[PDB]
Design a protein around this ligand. Structure first.
Ligand SMILES: *C(#N)[C]1[C][C](F)[C]N1C(=O)[C]([N])[C]1[C][C][C][C][C]1
Ligand SMILES: *C(#N)[C]1[C][C](F)[C]N1C(=O)[C]([N])[C]1[C][C][C][C][C]1
Lengths: 840, 848
C-alpha cells in the first residue's frame, strides 16, 4: 500500500487569513435581458441599439445600459462595444421575491418596454420609474434621469407592467390587489378589493394578481396578471382595456411561523405554506374590464368572473402554471396541471366566458343566459406521463388564418422521453356541452381535436425551456431558434430548424463551450454568454445572415464583444471531467479535482461535493472557478475533490430524471459510491479510508443519507439546510417526485432522514449540521426535529447556525464563517494527523 | 515540576454505559420527602394519640405525590426510636398529561413532581381541597365527622367548564364553597349543591391573546417567575350575615390588563407544526401590566343558593390611591376580615409599602354616570387606604412571605410582625404598632392626594431580632407565632451562614434567641399550629435528608424557656451512598473584605506528584447559595462523577450570592458580570497555592442560566485562566430579560447604559477567543424564560466577528431539562467535551 498524506494543520486565525488572501484578488452580473431596437437612420453608422441589464463592477448596482451595433465592422480587428449607461439614478415583499427568484443583485432586476413609444418601465426599490428611448422621441447620447410614477398608495408597489395597447397605462400590485395608473394624466385606480392591508393574514387570505409561494418557489411564475395586448374600440371614440388575473384564496392553507430577521424582537412571521398532502390555494381566473374615454379618463371598471366555477370548467386542475394572451388578444391562454403533475392541458379562454360579478341573483341569471352555450373553454392540447410534467416557458402562437383553427409551437417530453418541439394545429369546434340544459360537463367535453402534430425536433437530446432558455420564431423565413443538448449533455448550444418542413438542425454556436443565448426579435443577431472549464464567462454578439440562394439556411459571423473574460485566473486549476459506464445502464459524468503538488506514493483524503437532486446538473463544460472556487481551494490543501451527477439530475432526459420517482434518497448514493470506486481503482492517490461528503439543501439531504446508509464509506458528512422529513416540504415539489404520502408510505419513510435517526453513528466528529435560521424554504425545523430524535437516540452531532440567513447565504461575514468552519472541520476530522489520531 | 494527569479517554458509547451504570444504583433518590405538614388534635381523652399529622409525599421512585397521615402518640418509649407509619389518606388521578397552563405553572413553580402539588384545609369541617391533574377533589377528615382508619375516596368537584380549572381555594368562611380560575376568570362552585357560577367576565377563550389581554384572579408572568406569587385572588376569611338569614362572601382579586405588554413568540413544543406561541413578556424598560384591585361580593341565601353577585371596583383608580406602585407583591386579609392588605412595590423595587384596604373602599361597577356619582358620594371621605408601613433602601427590597397580623384590641390601632433588611442590612423581625387615623385627604373637595396623605404614624417599632445574620422568609421558610406564650418561631443563619436553624424568641420582651435545632446539619422546619411540636427536614454534606418530629415543652416556671425532645422519625435517610465521596467545604479571606466559602471535590485515587484538570461549576447570581452544609449527592452527584474521572471540582459563592446580608448581595448593583469572576479566580488561586494537584493551565467553567452567563464572562474576561467554558441557557443581553429581575439588580437601562453594556455578553463578542474547542453553548429550544434568542443573537455577533463556537440544542426542553433522554445526552456530551477539550492526552495534544 501507499503512505497517507496529512493536510497541514492551520490554526483558525491562519485559515481565516488564508481564505481572505485567496478571495481578495477573486461576483458581478454579466449582461442580460437583452433587447434590440433598430436605429432606422439610413445615413447613420448604426443598425441597432442593444439595451441590457448589468453591473459595471464589483459592489455596484445592477442597471440599464446600451451599446451601439454598427452597420459594418473592420474584420481585421475585434470590436469591444462600449457600455453607455441609460440612467442617472428592502420591504418583506422584495426580500421574499428575491429569495424565490434567487437574485443577489441590488437595483433593477427587470424592465418592461413598449416598442411604439420607446417607454421603459421599471422598479428601482421603493419607486416605479419611466423613461423614453428609441421610439419617435429618438435616441439619447447620454444617461437619462427617470421620472417617478406618482402614487397615493402607502405601501411598496410591486410587479409593474406597461399596457401593450396603451403605454400611458401601467398596472401594479399593492397589498395584494391590482391597481392601474396613468403616467400622463396621473389617474390612479384600484381594480381589485380582495385584501385588506390593515387585517391579520390569519383572517385575510385573499389576493389578486400575485403568484403564491409554491408558484414562485416550484414553478418560477412570479406574476398573477396579464394585460390583454389589444384594446377594443368603442362607438364613443373610447376603448376597453382588459387584465386577466389569478385570484387566490389561501384560507385553508396551513400557517407556519418563521423567525423574524429582527432577532431583537423575539417574534416570528406567518407564512401560508402548503405542506405535502395538504390544501393548495383555491384558485380562479377573473377579468377586469376597464372602459377609458376619448381623452384617457376612466369611465368605469367592471370586475368579471367565470360563468361557471373554475372547478367545473377545469375538472382536476390544481395549478395554473402559465398564462397569457394570444397575439391578437382574441383568447387568454393557460397551461394547467393536475395535482399529481402528470396531466398538462393548454386551454384557451375567451373573454366572453366572463360575466360581471353580481351578488343580486335575478340579475345574475340574466347575465348567465346572455352568454351562448357555444362559448366554452377550448383544450387545444392535453398530454400525460407516468413520470412528471416539467413546466417550461416555450409556447408560441401563430396568427389565426381561420376562426376555427389555431396553430402553435409547444415543447414536450411526453412522446419520446426527451423535450422536443412540436407544431400543432387544433380545431376550435362548438362543444357538445350546453350550459342551457343545466348539467355539468364530462372531462372530454372541452377537448379540441388535433388536425396535425408534426415533430420539429427529435432524438436522444433535449430542447431547453427553463432559466431563460426559450425559442425565437421567424415567421418570414419559417424558422425556429432554440437551445439544446444535441452535441453533448455537457454543453448547451444554439440551433436553428425549419418549422414548416423540418429537417437539418443547424448548430450556430461553437463547440468546446457551453452557451447561454438570446436572439434579437428581428432574427438577424444573437448573443451568447459562454464559458468552459478552463475559461471564464464571455459575452459576444453574432450577426445572422442567409445565402442569396436559400432564405431557410442560416450562417453566423462574429460581430463584437460585449464582455471580455478575465483570461484564466492565476490561483485556480480546473477539474477534469470524467465518465463511467454504470451498472445501472447509463453513462454518468463527474468532475475530479486532483490535489495540487501531488507527491507520488502518497494517498490523499477525499471530499465529495454533492447536490444530486432534480432540476440541477453540476457536471458540464462551464467555468466553475467562481461558484466552486473553494473546491479548488480544498484541492490546494491536499483534498481530492469529486463531484458526480447521479441519476435524477438534469439534461439527460425524463427517463434518467425519473429514476428516483417515489424513491428519493434510495438510489443517489449508489451512484456516488460507484463513481468513487471507479476513481479509486483508476487513481491510487484516493484514500478511501478518509472520505467526506458535503452539500446544501438536496445536497445536505444526501450527505445525511450517505452517512446513514454508507458509514463504511463516508467518514464525515456536513449537511447544509437538509430536508429531513419530506412531509414538511411543499406540495409542488414533493408530490411531483414522491406522490401523495398515503400512496407512498414506504418512500416517505425511507426517504426521510429524521424517521431513521437510530441509523446515525454513535461516534462523534462525523456529523455536522448547518442551517440558515430564518430559512422559509427548508424550515429550521428539519434540523431541529432531526436533533430531537438524535438526542432521544443518544447520538452525537455538531451544529452551526447562521442566524441572519434564509436558504441562501447573503451577508458576506456569514459566508466567510461558513467557509472557515468547513475547512477547519475537515482539517480536524478528516484531513490532518490529529484527525486520524483521534479515531478510537 | 509535577506531571500532568490525563483522564482516561472513553468512547462515546463507553461513557454512555458508564453514566448509565452509575445512575442505575441512584434511581431510588428522585423521590419527594414529606412536606406541607399540618397537625390536627385528636381531642380524645381515652385515645392513645394527641395528634394526626397530614402531609404530601411520594411512597417511592415512579409513584405520584399524594396525601398521607401519621398518628402522634401521647407518650413514647424513650429507650426506643419510633418510626411513624405512613397511612395513605386517599384511595387512588394524575398522569403526566398537562395543559399549557399547567406546564407553564410548573415551570414557574420549578416543580418536577407528578400528583398533588398542594392542598387546602378547613379546621372546623375537616375539608381538604386539592387539584390532582385535570380534576379538583375534596375529602373530610379530622372535623366533627371524625378520623378515618382507612383511605378515603376523593370526591370530584363536578363542572360545566370546558377547560382546565386552576388554583382552587376553599372559602375559609364557608367550606361548601370553592373558587378557581377558568380561562383567566374567577368562578365559584358549591361542592354540596353543585351550583357553579362565573364571577368575572374579562377574558374570552374564543379570542386571540393579541386582542384579549385581560385576566382576573391570576398572577402574570413576572409575578410567578420573579416574585413567587402564583395566585391573584383571596377569599375573605369571614362572612357578613344578612337580615334574611343568609350571608355575603367576598373575594379580593387582582385584575390585570396586558394590552401594552410586548408579545414575544416562543417555539411550540409540537415541532411538526412549525409554529410558535404568543407570550406577554415585559422586557426590561418596557410596560408591565396595568394592575388594579377589584372585589366580588356574593350574596348567598339561607340554604346556600346564590342570590346575586356584585362586582366592585376601587372608588378612585389604582394609580391615584397607590401613587408610584408598580407591583402587587403580596395580598390577603386581616384575620377578622375587616381589611384586605397588600405589600406594594415601586418600579425600582426600592420602596415597599404595606397597605390596608377596607371593603367600603369598593363600589359597584356602574357604566351609568348619574348612578355612579350617587355611589361615590355615598362613601365617606374618612374611608381611605391606610399605609401602615413604608420602607426604603439604596439596594433593593427582597420580598418575603413573613407578615403576621395580631387580633385588633382597638379600632384605631393595628399590631403586626414584619421582616426587613432596611434598618440593619440583615433581615430581622420587627413588632410594629401603627395608628389608623382619619386622613387629611377629603375626596369631597375634588382634588388628588399628595404622596404622604395615607401614611399611618408608627406608635412603636421594636426589633425582635438583631445581628450579623438573617431571618429566612422565602422558599417555605416562615414564622409561627404563639399568641398564648407570646413567642415567635423562625429560621435563620445565626449559628452559621452554612446551616439553617430553628429559633424561638419572645415578641413582647425580646432578648436571648434560643436555637432549637442541632448543630452539624442544615434544617428546614415546620412548626405545628398548636406550637407544641415541630418537624425538621435536615441533612449535611455526609448524610442524606432525614425527617424527624420533635416535641416542644417549657418548664412550669417559665413559658419563654423552650425545650425540645426527639419524638419520632418520619423519614430515615438512605445512610451514606456507597459510590459517593462528598466535597470539603473551605473558606478564604478575600481582598474584598469578606470571607467567601467554597466546596472542593478532590480527585479520587489522587496520585502524589501529579496535577489534575479542574472544573469550576458556577451559578453566582442573586437569590442562591451553592455552598452550605447540605447533602449534595443527589442534586450535584455528577460533580462527584467528574472527581471519579480525575477532575478537580470547585464551587465558590461569590459576592451577590444569598444568606450573607444585603451589603454582600448588593456588591453587584448596576454592575452585574463585573465582579463575580474576580472572586471565582481569587478562590481558585487560593486553592492552587494550598494544593499543588490543581493544574491551572487546564481549568474549565460550567453553569446554567446565570451560571451560563458567568461562564461566558469568565472566558471573555479571563481567557488566561479558563481554557474552556460551557454555557447553558446564558443571558447574553440584559435588555432581553424581564422587568422584575433585571431592573431590581441593574436599574432601568436608560439610566445605566454602561452597566447594561458591560453586563451583556453579546455586545462584547470581539472579546471571545479566536481558538476553537473553548466555547460550548447549550440551550433548551423552547425556553420561555431565557429565550433562545439570547443564544441566537450571541451567535449572530460571533459569526459577524469571525469567532468559533460549538452548540447543542435540546429541542424538547424549556429552561429546565425534564425529558430523561435530554438529560442523558446533556451529561454525556458534557463529559465527552471535557474529556476531548480539557482533561485527556488528546486534548492537550490538539492545542496548536
Ligand atoms: C433544496 N434544494 C430544497 C429542498 C429540496 F431539495 C428542494 N429544494 C429547493 O430549494 C427547490 N424548491 C428548488 C426548486 C428549483 C430547483 C432547485 C431546487
Ligand atoms: C437564570 N438563572 C435566569 C436568567 C437570569 F440569570 C435569572 N434567571 C432566572 O431564572 C430567575 N428568573 C430566577 C428567579 C428566582 C431565583 C433564581 C433565578
Amino acid at each position: 500500500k501507499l503512505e497517507p498524506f496529512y493536510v497541514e494543520r492551520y490554526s483558525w486565525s491562519q485559515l481565516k487569513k488564508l481564505l481572505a488572501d485567496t478571495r481578495k484578488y477573486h461576483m458581478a452580473k454579466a449582461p442580460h435581458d437583452f433587447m434590440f431596437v433598430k436605429r432606422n437612420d439610413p445615413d447613420g453608422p448604426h443598425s441597432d441599439r442593444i439595451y441590457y441589464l448589468a453591473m459595471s463592477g464589483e459592489n455596484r448596482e445592477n442597471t440599464l445600459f446600451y451599446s451601439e451595433i454598427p452597420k459594418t465592422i473592420n474584420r481585421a480587428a475585434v470590436l469591444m462595444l462600449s457600455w453607455k449607461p441609460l440612467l442617472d439614478l428592502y420591504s418583506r415583499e422584495e426580500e421574499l421575491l428575491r429569495e424565490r427568484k434567487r437574485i443577489g443583485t441590488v437595483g433593477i432586476a427587470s424592465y418592461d418596454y413598449h416598442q411604439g413609444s420607446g417607454t421603459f418601465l421599471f422598479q428601482a426599490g421603493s419607486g416605479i420609474y419611466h423613461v423614453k428611448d428609441g421610439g419617435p422621441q429618438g435616441f439619447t447620447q447620454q444617461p437619462l434621469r427617470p421620472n417617478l410614477v406618482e402614487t397615493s398608495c402607502p405601501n411598496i408597489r410591486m410587479d409593474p407592467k406597461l399596457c401593450p395597447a396603451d403605454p400611458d397605462w401601467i398596472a401594479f400590485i399593492h397589498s395584494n390587489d391590482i391597481w392601474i395608473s396613468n403616467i400622463v394624466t396621473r389617474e390612479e385606480r384600484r381594480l381589485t378589493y380582495v385584501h385588506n392591508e390593515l387585517a391579520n393574514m390569519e383572517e385575510d387570505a385573499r389576493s389578486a394578481g400575485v403568484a403564491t409561494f409554491v408558484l414562485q418557489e416550484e414553478f418560477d411564475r412570479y406574476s398573477g396578471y396579464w394585460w390583454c395586448p389589444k384594446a377594443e374600440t368603442t362607438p364613443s371614440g373610447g376603448k376597453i382595456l382588459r387584465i386577466l388575473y389569478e385570484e387566490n384564496d389561501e384560507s385553508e392553507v396551513e400557517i407556519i411561523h418563521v423567525t423574524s430577521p429582527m432577532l431583537e424582537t423575539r417574534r416570528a412571521d406567518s407564512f401560508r405554506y402548503p405542506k405535502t398532502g395538504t390544501a393548495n390555494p383555491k384558485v380562479t381566473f377573473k377579468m377586469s374590464e376597464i372602459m377609458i374615454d376619448a381623452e384617457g379618463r376612466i369611465i368605469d371598471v367592471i370586475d368579471k368572473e367565470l360563468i361557471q366555477p373554475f372547478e367545473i370548467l377545469f375538472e382536476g386542475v390544481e395549478y395554473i402554471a402559465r398564462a397569457g394572451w394570444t397575439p391578437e388578444g382574441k383568447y387568454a391562454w393557460s397551461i394547467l396541471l393536475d395535482r399529481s403533475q402528470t396531466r398538462l392541458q393548454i386551454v384557451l379562454i375567451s373573454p366572453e366566458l366572463f360575466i360581471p360579478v353580481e351578488d343580486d341573483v335575478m340579475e345574475r341569471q340574466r347575465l348567465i343566459e346572455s352568454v351562448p352555450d357555444s362559448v366554452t373553454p377550448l383544450i387545444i392540447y392535453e398530454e400525460t406521463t407516468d413520470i412528471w410534467i416539467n413546466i417550461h416557458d416555450i409556447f408560441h402562437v401563430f396568427p389565426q388564418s381561420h376562426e376555427e383553427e389555431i396553430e402553435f409551437i409547444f415543447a414536450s417530453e411526453c412522446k419520446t422521453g426527451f423535450r422536443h418541439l412540436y407544431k400543432i394545429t387544433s380545431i376550435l369546434k362548438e362543444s357538445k356541452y350546453k350550459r342551457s340544459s343545466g348539467g355539468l360537463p364530462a372531462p372530454s367535453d372541452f377537448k379540441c381535436p388535433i388536425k396535425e402534430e408534426i415533430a420539429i425536433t427529435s432524438g436522444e437530446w433535449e430542447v431547453l425551456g427553463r432559466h431563460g432558455s426559450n425559442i425565437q420564431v421567424d415567421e418570414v423565413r419559417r424558422l425556429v431558434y432554440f437551445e439544446g443538448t444535441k452535441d453533448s449533455p455537457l454543453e448547451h448550444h444554439l440551433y436553428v430548424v425549419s418549422y414548416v418542413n423540418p429537417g437539418e438542425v443547424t448548430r450556430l454556436t461553437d463547440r468546446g463551450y457551453s452557451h447561454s443565448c438570446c436572439i434579437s426579435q428581428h432574427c438577424d443577431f444573437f448573443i451568447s454568454k459562454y464559458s468552459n472549464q478552463k475559461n471564464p464567462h464571455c459575452v459576444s454578439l453574432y450577426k445572422l445572415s442567409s445565402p442569396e440562394d436559400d432564405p431557410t439556411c442560416k450562417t453566423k459571423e462574429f460581430w463584437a464583444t460585449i464582455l471580455d473574460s478575465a483570461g484564466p485566473l492565476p490561483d485556480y486549476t480546473p477539474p477534469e471531467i470524467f465518465s463511467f459506464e454504470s451498472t445501472t445502464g447509463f453513462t454518468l459524468y463527474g468532475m475530479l479535482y486532483k490535489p495540487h503538488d501531488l507527491q507520488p506514493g502518497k494517498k490523499y483524503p477525499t471530499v465529495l461535493f454533492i447536490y444530486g437532486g432534480p432540476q440541477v446538473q453540476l457536471v458540464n463544460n462551464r467555468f466553475k472557478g467562481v461558484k466552486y472556487f473553494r473546491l479548488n481551494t480544498l484541492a490546494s490543501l491536499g483534498y481530492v475533490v469529486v463531484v458526480i451527477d447521479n441519476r435524477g439530475s438534469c439534461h439527460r432526459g425524463l427517463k434518467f430524471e425519473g429514476a428516483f420517482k417515489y424513491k428519493m434518497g434510495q438510489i443517489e448514493i449508489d451512484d456516488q459510491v460507484e463513481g468513487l470506486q471507479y476513481l479509486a481503482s483508476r487513481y491510487d492517490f484516493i484514500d478511501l479510508d478518509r472520505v467526506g461528503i458535503h452539500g446544501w439543501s438536496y445536497g445536505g439531504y444526501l450527505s445525511l443519507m450517505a452517512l446513514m446508509q454508507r458509514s463504511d464509506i463516508f467518514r464525515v458528512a456536513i449537511a447544509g439546510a437538509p430536508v429531513t422529513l419530506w412531509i414538511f416540504y411543499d406540495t409542488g415539489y414533493t408530490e411531483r417526485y414522491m406522490g401523495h404520502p398515503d400512496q407512498n408510505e414506504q418512500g416517505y419513510y425511507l426517504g426521510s432522514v429524521a424517521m431513521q435517526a437510530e441509523k446515525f453513528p454513535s461516534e462523534p466528529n462525523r456529523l455536522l449540521l448547518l442551517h440558515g435560521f430564518l430559512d422559509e424554504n427548508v424550515h429550521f425545523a428539519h434540523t431541529s426535529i432531526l436533533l430531537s430524535f438524535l438526542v432521544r437516540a443518544g447520538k452525537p452531532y455538531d451544529l452551526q447556525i447562521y442566524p441572519q440567513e434564509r436558504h441562501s447565504i447573503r451577508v458576506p461575514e456569514s459566508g466567510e464563517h461558513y467557509e472557515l468552519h468547513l475547512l477547519h472541520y475537515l482539517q480536524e476530522n478528516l484531513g490532518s494527523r490529529i484527525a486520524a489520531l483521534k479515531v478510537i
